[PDB]
Amino acid sequence: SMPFPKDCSQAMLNGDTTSGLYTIYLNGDKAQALEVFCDMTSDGGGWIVFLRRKNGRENFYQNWKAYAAGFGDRREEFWLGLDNLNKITAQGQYELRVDLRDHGETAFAVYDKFSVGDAKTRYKLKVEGYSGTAGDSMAYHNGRSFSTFDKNCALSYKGAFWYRNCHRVNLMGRYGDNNHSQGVNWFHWKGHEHSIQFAEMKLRPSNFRNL
Numbered sequence: 001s002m003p004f005p006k007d008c009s010q011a012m013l014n015g016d017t018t019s020g021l022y023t024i025y026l027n028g029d030k031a032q033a034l035e036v037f038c039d040m041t042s043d044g045g046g047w048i049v050f051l052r053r054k055n056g057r058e059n060f061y062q063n064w065k066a067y068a069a070g071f072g073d074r075r076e077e078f079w080l081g082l083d084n085l086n087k088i089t090a091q092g093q094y095e096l097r098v099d100l101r102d103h104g105e106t107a108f109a110v111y112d113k114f115s116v117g118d119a120k121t122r123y124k125l126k127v128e129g130y131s132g133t134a135g136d137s138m139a140y141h142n143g144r145s146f147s148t149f150d151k152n153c154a155l156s157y158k159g160a161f162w163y164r165n166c167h168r169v170n171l172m173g174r175y176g177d178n179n180h181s182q183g184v185n186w187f188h189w190k191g192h193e194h195s196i197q198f199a200e201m202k203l204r205p206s207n208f209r210n211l
């Protein structure tokens with residue numbers, strides 16, 4: 001086992017094949033512990049989950065400081081934090097996976113390259129190299145800074161995201177809200193008048209597939 005695994009891929013290879021809460025260590029530093037939910041089952045596992053929507057119990061209409069730090073219950077609905085995502089994605093080349101489920105239908109998107117810049121970039125999104133069944137709805141968002149109501153699409157749609165003008169992905173939108181562009185949307189799968197029941201965003205090293 002690795003003593004200070006830097007992501008859920010290093011924590012998995014530690015043999016641990018059950019999804020749930022694990023400690024990772026940013027940059028392998030024992031003083032930078034972070035509790036994360038590891039999805040150890042989806043497409044070979046090793047995924048740090050950083051967003052989960054499943055029941056509408058948690059409020060995602062939150063401010064910059066909340067999006068920077070993270071909020072919620074890692075075992076249920078939560079947001080890991082942009083500062084965490086920046087520090088994880090700085091460690092190497094990561095891939096993004098998005099898992100969606102709504103009334104029994106499932107879809108996914110993988111982006112071979114995923115990074116989140118630091119606070120001086122307003123946590124700029126990079127997403128490249130799409131494959132999947134959900135449809136490439138993140139391309140629209142590529143290179144955009146993060147937006148909250150206090151730093152306007154966030155205000156106008158009551159969510160938070162790497163907004164442009166405004167969105168094709170709104171996974172931090174209002175749960176069960178089928179009003180145009182208000183809900184948990186992935187436009188190229190279910191459009192803007194269909195709020196998705198279940199959504200996860202997760203990351204792991206892009207080289208995991210052949211390590």
Ligand SMILES: Cc1nc(CN2CCC(CN)CC2)cs1
Pocket residue numbers: 069070071072073074078079080081084
């Ligand atoms: C007493 C505290 N509550 C939190 C909330 N959230 C931040 C940790 C995690 C994101 N990195 C999701 C949950 C942090 S410290």
